[PDB]
């Protein structure tokens, strides 16, 4: 595509520069270009890909929430009619968000997931698949909402099955997957009890494995464990 003429290594280098400059749209475009070279991604490169799109979609989600709240208020009793503009602009932002999600899901399907054989890579990409279907579910209101939710669930579940077989309970990818799948249960699937159970079991199994870790690995795992605890505190 647009980045077809730039070297893979140059795209990676520029993604890192874009991150330093907080230019996340550029970062995402560079990493899309790097994926489309067709080679597998290293650990570092996978994290550049995820950081870039997380920041782009994160801004879109925040904007969508603002606009949705204004729209909800416009449709309350006693609200004066202001015309189609709030709905139109919310729809514009929504369409852009859906486009970013479709872009990410497209990269995963063509062909990151199918070439990922190691547990660390495969779980990482399946977590991404679940996350981006979750973002589509957040804005879905139509005939496909159930199918979108089931697509998220299925991706998370495959990732969980691999992670439990192949990774220690303190592995950061495994922990972050569980954190996000727990949020899926609470916020998307209307299953708060499942969310709470998953967060608690994950935390406790990680606690019991901390003794095996170096100082630096301990720091990484305990950071994510604290996010599990934070959600449990929010929900209980």
């Amino acid at each position: 595509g647009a980045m077809g003429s730039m070297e893979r290594a140059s795209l990676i280098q520029k993604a890192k520069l874009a991150e330093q400059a907080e230019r996340y749209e550029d970062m995402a475009a560079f990493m899309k270009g790097a994926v489309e070279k067709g080679e597998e991604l290293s650990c570092e490169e996978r994290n550049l890909l995820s950081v870039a799109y997380k920041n782009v979609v994160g801004g879109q989600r925040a904007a969508w929430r603002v606009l949705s709240s204004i729209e909800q208020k416009s449709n309350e009793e006693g609200s004066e009619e202001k015309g189609p503009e709030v709905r139109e602009y919310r729809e514009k932002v929504e369409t852009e968000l859906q486009g970013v999600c479709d872009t990410v899901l497209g990269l995963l399907d063509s062909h990151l997931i199918k070439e990922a054989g190691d547990a660390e890579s495969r779980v990482f990409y399946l977590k991404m698949k679940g996350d981006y279907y979750r973002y589509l579910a957040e804005v879905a209101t139509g005939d496909d909402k159930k199918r979108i939710i089931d697509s998220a669930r299925s991706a998370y579940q495959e990732a969980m099955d691999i992670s439990k077989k192949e990774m220690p309970p303190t592995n950061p990818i495994r922990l972050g997957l569980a954190l996000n799948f727990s949020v899926f249960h609470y916020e998307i699937a209307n299953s708060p009890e499942e969310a709470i159970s998953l967060a608690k079991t994950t935390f406790d199994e990680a606690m019991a494995d901390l003794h095996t870790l170096s100082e630096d690995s301990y720091k990484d795992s305990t950071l994510i464990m604290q996010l599990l605890r934070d959600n449990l505190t929010l929900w209980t």
Binding site: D131, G176, L179, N180, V183, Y186, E187, I224, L227, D230, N231, L234, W235
Partner: peptide, 5 residues
């Protein structure tokens, strides 16, 4: 909103 990574 709850924490995700």
């Amino acid at each position: 909103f709850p924490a995700t990574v």
